[PDB]
């Protein structure tokens, strides 16, 4: 009798399945969603409530961009799931409700991660931290930040300072965790609490029998803290007049219930990336049903989605200036995975798939949510064209290869965390690790571990390369060794980091929405792949000569001849990049990791391409000192000159089999390069992607693609006239950003990047 | 190899040894202490400052005893090593300084252990907990209490309620840890901090190499927290005008420095027992030197010791009424190990050994410190007689077998924690476990796990004996099966308990005074040994008729025929006891334990003999329901009737080899039973102990002995006239207590115990 009276009332009309007897969101979707292959013809426009609400919010957004600072934020309250009272923009107009604090865009204090960062923010934005809060989180409640720096080695500290291993999650929430928020809409809190209680009890035997004693005790307490979090979710909702103890009854509640789950998360955790998951299709099941019963109109459907997506555009977090340069544009990464194909061949695309992209029109361009299209050659052409259309009109979408990941996971319910990190919802998470500086690692190989800017020993002491002319084999050999060292220091830092985060900032509310046992990966990132690969190409195909100073340190390089650069579909250099990705992966792969997280790799950088760039001296490839690296796996600025097809082919060659955490690529192409009119552009854009993502047994294919369709001229104009593009949005590294939210220097990077002029 | 000046100066005149190049307090003592074999002839009397100070303090002590409540305590301050300002009794009179709070006897709040207990105290003593403190330690900083109850099993909860496993360290500091406070006097804080930093660095390799990853990270953070604690010790002292960064320069500083180390501990941790260690002889080295240089007089020597011992008489902790009945008499267990013999044959007895016992005269009888004489047949007779004399005059001393433990440890620098738990100072500690109700375990065996009082299924559901007469073999078989169950539940509870204590209440300041790696034992206690052993005798040498009820539940027993009772040297009852001790040990010995603590056992109860007694129904031995068990390993009240030599022989037979955590025995004897005059008494008392402790290759011998020399009549008088015996002190379970500090019921227990009338 797993069919209570409300359960039955709430699920009235839903197809039966295991999902009614156990927690299985995937099954529910499979037995109930209705595939859609039509076009946008049905989409409705914004309601007056929507426009009124959004415009009010934009006023705060303009203030943020203009002042490059928070509109406001807490100074004396420690944020919790239940700490704040309900806040609204206009209670009489919102269909979906919920704010992190009591006021739109006001940022909170999440002290559990560390008190020093909060002080830094207070100082930077001219505000005073409440002395009691400071005392509590320095003497009574130890923070994640304190725990990490109490266990760090001086070597790691040197790497942090020199710029070889900087920006790791030791001063901000680790994130990279997506709780299955859909669960609360489907089952209700009470049902989920009973399920957790069962999970809790299932560990008693092992405990009593001393089986994995410490691991079992840890999991028990975690599940207990999870159970307690679910109860707080209810209290949180209650403050808003909602009772979410039971399952969602209609579309409106399905949306509200799911958002409420996410709200608890962004009210309690600092995560660099707090992704939404794969919810559009799921919610469509409730929308369809209400539509078919004539309980809701189509325009009322969009309104709800709009108000949901609107709240996602309002998620904010207090960050330090240091954080701002590591992750530019006030990012949040409220990622939504749309479309895709099921394992049974039908498309997961639905009307709600369109409703989501339509928020870009209904409310203009927006950086968040980070809407990600799970691409497949088998997608309904109607959808392929419309997505491309939205990309052409807004440059607010990103695409990931569903033909590649779906099979790799052999699951059709996986989502994208942050930029390109895949995970099966509710069953897997990542132990976030920013990225290491691969380029500086090569310089260390040439300078015997001495940093070229600080001139102090950082890497293992060893003899610097002597020749007057660099030689490929020799340089590769020393780099290989220095990469062993990097891998050991990197894993070591992450091991202590995730040990402390589990201890002082366990994300209870998010883990409560996962199975009892969750798969964990140790995601390691690589920055400057293209500067590293080219540098080698220069050395292996041209004559690179080091210019050394009085101490013999290589401070510059002269080049005689030309060499194949990455991104021009030239195996000579591309094979070198493919090789680097492979080496590093095979190295971090041999190290022991905390809680046995499976080491993984990603070619992602975020704004680390800028921070690592200015901390890295002249390199063999020719890049001058202080120059930004390329975003993610992108060729170095302007070096990919053989058009789109070429650059796309080079990147697609990068082995996702060794970069399971994702391979980011930002593609900027001028309007006319795609065609003379939108119909041609839509068709050509789609075509380009089908080729890039083309997955075959002997052709892995590309994994990700940001799509920017614009003219460099337009950006230059924006720089001069901010007030003219309040909502201008652009893809910059695997996520979107409002151009005006960037700094001068960061904009400088963007505008100097490659603007594909032809195919 | 030049010694830093500060060291060379403070160490002027001291004999060289490894102790100057490493942390080795044992070596320092060995190369510098001067053995003493003389008598008390030299002891000086109290100074006027001493008497004035003590009398002032007694006023507060009378208030405590009278009201059975704290004189005062914090309500809004979270205690820390540096949280309070200096407090005094009379700054112009104290030679040694330091109080837990800013006022004599005012108790603090040690929230890290749990907030509920603090609320309970506030409620019981009519005071209001500051709401901010409550909020902080329920929502922001998780406590030990919260963590334990989040992981407990419902079985353990039932055992807790039924009275089979109750009073475990889940609602108060675990204690049983003795930091080598002598280290700060010998080396100074700075030297110790450099040593810790070295320890910290010695773990880096393993860390980087993924060797015991999690254990290494834990130890690193612990050592870091230790290092940070040492620095706080300095700040703490500074508030008193002392700079303890450097080594102690004279006797006065040696004492002050050592106490300062202990003060930090009792200012930061709740420990049930916060023992002092083995310091008297150590301090004598500094006293001798100052004496020989004519820098200090003998009377000035006693004054210092008196002021030190006086502060030890002032240590207080906020406890709940529940705690008060589990550990009666407002105990602290500031245990001092005096005398003993070195491994090289010479006695560790010194003039300071006498100075310490002399505080009993200089300032009257006192429960604290818990002065423990490490007894040896080879002790200078002058000392044996004087100790006995002090016992006869005050009943404030206890004796432990040095001839047994010294060899077992093959170390002459071990101390006694709490009552009878031995440990090599600075190198070993214990994971305290209260005690289990062995008696109730036998009843469960006879009633198939159903609690003979709450009639609920507590133990594993089984069939109760059906016999009309209880048969030993059958009963035992069951008992065995049930002991297995007890052992699993007990170890399981302690495993989670010490896991949480390491997590939420790590005793940083005490561990900072230990080596990098510390030996840990999982100390489990057995209560009601004598009621259990006798009960078996009855069933095996008489006729026990099980008076059942309308469910078959045995709620009483009829006894036909006399039967052997423990404590009368009857191998038929004595051999049962020895066997029980063995069985339980061999059982808990097979279970996996947290951090690999080596399971250990002790026959100790504290006031649990009263709490478990009233929660246990009629037993086969004849004891009525609600009747107190015997303290520790003592025969049940009044059953040992063959005089001293007999009862002592029975107890000495108990196997210390299976009760490594100690075997407590309260021995009370009437004055005339020992002799017609003190000279005879002194000699006879000493003789009794030499026999009891007699250690031979085939005669293990006794381990502990409390010595009470008094007339039951005197106590009866005290009960009626409290105000007449303000300082009356008595041994009650392996520690001392001011008679007036006990409850009516607890006094009731004491007076009904055996008062040996002859030898």
Swiss-Prot record, chains A, B:
It is an enzyme of class 2 (transferase). It comes from the Bacteria. Keywords: Acetylation, Acyltransferase, Carbohydrate metabolism, Cytoplasm, Glucose metabolism, Organic radical, Transferase. The modification Glycine radical is found at residue 734. Pathway: Fermentation; pyruvate fermentation; formate from pyruvate: step 1/1. The keyword Cytoplasm applies. GO terms for molecular function: formate C-acetyltransferase activity. It catalyses: formate + acetyl-CoA = pyruvate + CoA. Catalyzes the conversion of pyruvate to formate and acetyl-CoA. In addition, may be involved in the control of the activity of the formate channel FocA, via direct interaction with FocA. This is Formate acetyltransferase 1. It comes from Escherichia coli (strain K12).
